[PDB]
């Protein structure tokens, strides 16, 4: 009920009646293919259904403002700690094509040994609670009906409270989530016996909810010393989670490998990463690919990130990507901002649309060094697996440091992370099930003695209680807030203030950050500190240098800084006034043709300025179909006016470059008077141009239009067709 494209999200209203919000729909949605889709003048081969409302690429303006959408689901990651601001960004992202919103959790949420409740402020992520998931799912319902296409809402099931979250997620219609028991062990040191036992249940629940599962293997890129060495391990992590999840009962089509090309330039990254990508699509046929973009080998340049991303996207197009997640170009510079999520989404769209149909024109040289390297990588993985069994299994393998090691398997440098079968978080919390163990709910993995009560209900253990919450959503206990001071209501109350002053933001309301970019002709360290002194003198505060690039050691340095604006702008204090297009102009001249006579007048030999506004090269009026009779230079006003009569013209266009003793205005007078003197004056137009002309002062000398420095053919063509139009 609502959403009007010209009105913002009523975030306040969104936060109301969450206790009553039920999700509209369940499960993961893929995009709808659209075979041979025509948009404007083009036909696309790898497109999905267009959006109902959306913001097209800037250069879409040359093509009817078409917004072709590629076939992969597109991810953007939004999680600043204030989900209530983030909700606004989600709306921007969906307009720019994002259909998979990933909410990273407040740092260390893996460690919470149960659900948390309400809307505390997060740190480097949003604290995941029922109320917050409802806020956003509710929000994304409104945003998705508007854009016209369903959005997959996504977060994380990782940790010691996986089963708890999987339940909450499954009730609230969370569409996708990450779950990898190996993540918990390797990177959070969750006891490994507890991690694997919990996953069985977590995955069982996610299967119920028909959610997309993403794995944890991107982590091995980040923790590898040299990521181009870690591919055997990735294959192993992908395999182990994949088959575990399958045997639990999750569908092959919901199990997605999280696969990030290992390297970036100046490495030869296509060559190093492409065989990995193929080997992976081949060994893992059946399963889904979630491509995601580089973060390891990335710096403070948004340009550099973007370029590397297009190569990431290329690897995806040359192989296969079911999901293509994105990383914001500022990720390694600053906590992501609104504008950079949007950059990311546009880049993914742009690049993938650019490559529409590419695989009908390009193919892999499958035999050749590609084939050999693919065969080699597969062997390295196989050997990793054989050695895990030789050590006596997965647990022994982790205890001996086989994972997170810096070697190119089978080389072991001996610097892995060894977890201890008896150690880690929640070590000592596994409990043997008795013969009479029972759980009366849908979607329980383990041994369940239901027969001791009812033979018949074995296949639907929930019946013992006439629905668990997966059947009877009313048995869910919603908790609003547990902390009276640290919550969304207190925070929103804090900025009722802005709801009609205005100021910038990057992530939170009125947070006042802006980006400053400048070049400074000096060494980099001097440049850095000089840059801060300029930003101070522009009244910015909390000034930080966040990118330095060297142009040349001596010649100077590029510097970006972010700063705070310590005041606002009253919108209503703004003076804001209340446009013919090149094509409109061209159609006008076809209907009624327009004819011109033109000379550089007096004893002036300077020919270029006039030529500039006539030759088609730089957008002169020749471009718009105008017919031009050029009489050269030093051409007396007399002969120019006689020539307009002679030729039977619509306009005189003269140039005055020489201007000593205002001879350039003195010669406009003439043309006007001479044209009066002869009588053509009202039936013909007269524009006049010059270096020292002022478009004001030249209407003053009798003539119709004046033209100074910078005049283009668009300007003189504009004039002609609008005046002509005052008459006829």
């Amino acid at each position: 009920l609502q959403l009007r494209v010209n009105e913002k999200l009523d975030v306040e209203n969104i936060l109301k009646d969450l206790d009553k919000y039920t999700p509209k729909r369940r499960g993961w949605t893929w995009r709808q293919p659209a075979e041979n889709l025509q948009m404007g003048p083009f036909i696309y081969k790898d497109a999905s259904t267009p959006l109902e409302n959306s913001v097209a690429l800037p250069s879409a303006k040359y093509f009817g403002d078409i917004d072709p959408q590629p076939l992969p689901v597109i991810t953007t990651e939004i999680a600043s700690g204030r989900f209530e601001d983030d909700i606004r960004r989600m709306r921007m992202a969906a307009w720019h094509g994002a259909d998979h919103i990933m909410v990273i959790r407040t740092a260390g949420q893996s460690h919470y040994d149960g659900l948390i409740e309400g809307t505390p402020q997060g740190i480097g992520g949003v604290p995941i609670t029922r109320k917050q998931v409802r806020a956003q799912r509710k929000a994304l319902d409104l945003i998705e009906e508007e854009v016209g296409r369903p959005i997959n809402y996504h977060s994380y099931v990782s940790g010691v409270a996986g089963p708890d979250i999987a339940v909450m997620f499954a009730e609230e219609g969370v569409n996708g989530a990450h779950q990898d028991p190996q993540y918990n062990v390797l990177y959070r040191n969750i006891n490994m016996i507890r991690s694997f036992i919990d996953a069985c249940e977590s995955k069982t629940i996610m299967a119920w909810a028909d959610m997309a599962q993403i794995d944890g293997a991107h982590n091995a890129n980040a923790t590898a010393r040299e990521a181009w060495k870690v591919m055997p391990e990735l294959m192993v992590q992908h395999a182990l989670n994949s088959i575990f999840s399958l045997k639990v009962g999750m569908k092959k089509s919901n199990i997605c490998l999280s696969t990030v090309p290992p390297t970036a330039p100046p490495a030869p990254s296509m060559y190093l990463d492409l065989p990995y990508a193929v080997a992976l699509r081949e060994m893992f046929e059946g399963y889904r690919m979630r491509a995601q973009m580089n973060t390891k080998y990335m710096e403070a340049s948004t340009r550099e990130a973007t370029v590397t991303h297009v190569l990431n996207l290329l690897i995806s197009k040359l192989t296969r990507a079911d999901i293509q997640s994105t990383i914001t170009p500022d990720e390694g510079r600053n906590v992501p901002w609104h504008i950079y999520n949007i950059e990311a989404c546009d880049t993914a769209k742009q690049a993938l649309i650019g490559m529409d149909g590419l695989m009908d024109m390009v193919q892999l040289k499958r035999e050749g060094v590609l084939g050999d390297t693919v065969r080699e990588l597969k062997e390295r993985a196989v050997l990793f697996m054989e050695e895990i069994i030789e050590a006596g299994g997965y647990f022994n393998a982790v205890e001996q440091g086989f994972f997170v090691d810096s070697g190119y398997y089978p080389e072991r440098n001996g610097d892995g992370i060894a977890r201890q079968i008896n150690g880690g978080i929640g070590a000592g919390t596994v409990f043997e099930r008795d013969e009479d163990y029972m759980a009366p709910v849908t979607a329980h993995f383990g041994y369940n003695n239901v027969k001791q009560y009812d033979e018949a209900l074995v296949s639907e253990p929930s019946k013992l209680i006439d629905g668990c919450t997966l059947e009877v959503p009313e048995k869910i206990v919603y908790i609003d807030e547990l902390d009276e001071n640290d919550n969304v209501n207190v925070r929103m109350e804090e900025t009722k203030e802005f709801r009609s002053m205005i100021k910038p933001e990057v992530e939170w309301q009125a947070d006042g950050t802006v980006l400053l970019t400048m070049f400074l002709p000096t060494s980099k360290r001097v440049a850095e500190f000089a840059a801060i002194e300029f930003a101070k003198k522009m009244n910015l505060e909390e000034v930080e240098v966040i990118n330095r690039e060297v142009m040349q050691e001596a010649e100077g340095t590029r510097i970006e800084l972010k700063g705070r604006v310590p005041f606002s702008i009253d919108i209503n204090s703004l003076v804001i006034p209340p446009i013919l297009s090149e094509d409109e102009i061209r159609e006008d001249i076809e209907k009624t043709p327009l004819k011109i006579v033109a000379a550089t007048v007096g004893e002036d030999e300077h020919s270029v300025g006039l030529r500039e506004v006539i030759d088609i090269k730089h957008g002169g009026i020749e471009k718009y179909g105008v017919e031009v009779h050029y009489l050269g230079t030093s051409v007396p006003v007399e002969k120019l006016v006689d020539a307009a009569i002679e030729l039977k013209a619509d306009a005189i266009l003269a140039s005055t470059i020489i201007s000593h003793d205002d001879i350039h205005y003195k010669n406009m007078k003439r043309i006007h008077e001479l044209a009066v003197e002869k009588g053509i004056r009202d039936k013909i137009m007269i524009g006049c141009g010059g270096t020292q002309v002022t478009p004001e002062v030249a209407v003053k000398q009798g003539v119709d239009a004046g033209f100074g420095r910078g005049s283009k053919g668009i300007h003189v063509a504009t004039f002609l067709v609008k005046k002509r139009r005052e008459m006829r």
């Binding site: 040994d113 659900l115 948390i116 409740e117 409270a161 996986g162 089963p163 708890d164 999987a166 339940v167 909450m168 016996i193 036992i197 919990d198 069985c200 629940i205 395999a239 182990l240 994949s242 088959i243 575990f244 045997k247 639990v248 081949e282 060994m283 065969r375 597969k378 993985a381 196989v382 050997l383 697996m385 054989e386 895990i388 069994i389 299994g393 997965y394 080389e411 929640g426 596994v430 409990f431 043997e432 099930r433 008795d434 163990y437 029972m438 759980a439 009366p440 709910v441 329980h444 993995f445 383990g446 041994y447 013992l464 209680i465 668990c468 919450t469 997966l470 048995k475 206990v477 908790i479």
Partner: protein, 109 residues
């Protein structure tokens, strides 16, 4: 080293090699799945309680008390269920009671 080690794999066809990969992957995981069948954890029991009608707060309390009495092997949910039936009370009441210390002697019995 890689050369020496790969020698046995050097004659496998791609599908011998791929299925072998997966076969071993499977042997590495079967034992982990077995542990998941025969064992439980407080998150699993808390999650079972969520699904039976209880809050997070309430699940914590029931499960914490379930561990104190060394009853995990029966399933926190089972406890709440059996108690409900031998007091002719609702699931929702047994569990709230239990979350507050009542009925644990009866459960042990």
């Amino acid at each position: 080293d890689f050369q020496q080690r790969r020698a046995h794999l050097a004659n496998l066809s791609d599908e011998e090699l791929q299925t072998r990969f997966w076969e071993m992957a499977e042997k590495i995981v079967d034992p982990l799945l077995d542990l998941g069948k025969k064992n439980t954890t407080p998150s699993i029991e808390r999650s079972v309680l969520l699904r039976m009608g209880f809050s997070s707060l309430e699940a914590k309390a029931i499960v914490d008390k379930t561990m104190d009495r060394g009853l995990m092997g029966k399933g926190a949910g089972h406890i709440v269920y059996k108690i409900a039936k031998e007091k002719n009370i609702s699931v929702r009441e047994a569990g709230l009671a239990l979350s507050e210390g009542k009925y644990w002697d009866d459960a042990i019995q």
